[PDB]
Amino acid sequence: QRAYANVNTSLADAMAVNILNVKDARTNVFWADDAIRIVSQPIPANHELFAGMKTTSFSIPDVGLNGIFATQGDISTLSGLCRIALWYGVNATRPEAIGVGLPGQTA
Amino acid sequence: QRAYANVNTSLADAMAVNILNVKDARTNVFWADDAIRIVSQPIPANHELFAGMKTTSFSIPDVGLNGIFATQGDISTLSGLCRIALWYGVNATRPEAIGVGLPGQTA
């Protein structure tokens, strides 16, 4: 367990908890390129179980993710619904490799 | 402007307004034809926004207005709905040409 140590000493009884962001600051974010990742899952709205509505694959332009474009009509109201759904999760596997740059940290 | 004058003289400071509905009489109507206009519009429920519902044109040839015929069934009841919608407006574009005949007006 001590092979994974990242700090010289343990959290003592009543050490002070220094706060770094003492002033509002727009952040400069830096990381190592693999420390952050997006995880996507398909939404199977094209399955035969969803027969009523019309489902097409939807492309998100730049991020390289795929969603679904669904439309369904109601006859009692003569109104239709359009849904674009995208399923993903942003994960930080290496938070220790991600950093934030906070300038003007006074008062 | 004077080319459109339809009345001998304007309304004075105080001239009595003569009521002409003095008895409840069923109306007789006369007009010059095409004084009434029927404005009709389509209902685009055949658009892709309406996917679970089956929509087709519906002609009512007795008058000359095309309506919409739509059907949509649900699986939980194994029942379907049928809607026949007609969108129109009745407009009296020449009210001076429409006339009303009122018999037995004495009060």
**Contacting residues of A for B52, CB less than 8 Å apart:** 52-53, 72-74
Evaluate whether B99 touches B35 at the Cβ level (below 8 Å): no
Question: In the beta sheet, which residues pair with residue A91?
Answer: A37
Shortest Cα distance from A60 to chain B (angstroms)? 20
Q: Name the experimental technique.
A: cryo-EM
CA dist list (Å): A34 to A60, A95, A100, B30: 22, 10, 16, 84
Q: Which of residues 14-73 of A touch B (CB under 8 A)?
A: 52-54, 71-73
Contact A72 B85 (CB under 8 A): no
Q: How far is A76 from chain B (nearest CA, A)?
A: 8
| Sheet of B79-85, strands arranged across | B54-60, B65-74, B79-85
Q: Which of B15, B26, B24 is nearest to B100 (CA)?
A: B26
> Which residue of chain B is at minimal alpha-carbon distance from A54?
B51
What does the block give as tokens for A20? 């770094």
Q: What are phi and psi of B2, to 5 degrees?
A: -60, -25
Question: Taking CA atoms, what residue in A is nearest to B85?
Answer: A78
Q: Are A82 and A88 in contact (CB under 8 A)?
A: no
C-alpha A95 chain-centroid distance: 14
